[PDB]
Amino acid sequence: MWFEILPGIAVMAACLFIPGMATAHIHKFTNGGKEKRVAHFSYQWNLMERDRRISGVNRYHVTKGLENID
């Protein structure tokens, strides 16, 4: 019956699940467990560069908290 179309469709769904999900996980893996920082407009880029400089390990996602203010 018509549900015999469901298997192949399901396969397609799986094939369409992989890309987006993958991106998210990679964005969590390369950005220290947080969302990848988006930078348009050249002000967010300056914020990211300042974060990288004050990080000390040349990685922007490493966040310095209030414990670093002495």
Partner 1 sequence: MFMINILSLIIPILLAVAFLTLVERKVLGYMQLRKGPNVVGPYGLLQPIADALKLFTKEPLRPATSSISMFIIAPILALSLALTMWVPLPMPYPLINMNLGVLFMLAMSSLAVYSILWSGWASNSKYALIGALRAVAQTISYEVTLAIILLSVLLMNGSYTLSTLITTQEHIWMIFTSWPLAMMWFISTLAETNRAPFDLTAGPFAMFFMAEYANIIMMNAFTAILFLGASHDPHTPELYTINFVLKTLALTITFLWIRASYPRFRYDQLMHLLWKSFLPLTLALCMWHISLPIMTASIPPQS
Partner 2 sequence: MTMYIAFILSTIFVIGFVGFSSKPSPIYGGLGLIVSGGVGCGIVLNFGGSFLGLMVFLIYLGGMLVVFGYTTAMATGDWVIYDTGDSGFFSEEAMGIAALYSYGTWLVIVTGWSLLIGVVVIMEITRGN
Which residues form the interface with partner 2 (CB under 8 A)?
A: 40-43, 46
CA Rg, the chain, in Å? 20
Task: Scan residues 31-60 and list those touching ligand PEE (CB under 6 A).
Answer: 39-40
Residue 62 within binding range of partner 1, rule CB under 8 A: no
The residue written with tokens 């988006």 in the block is 38
Beta carbon of residue 45, minimum distance to partner 2 (angstroms, whole number): 8
Q: Collapsing DSSP states into helix, strand and coil, what is residue 65?
A: coil
Contact pick of 29, 43, 68, 69 for partner 1 (by CB under 8 A): 29
Quick count: other Cβ atoms within 10 Å of Cβ 1?
4
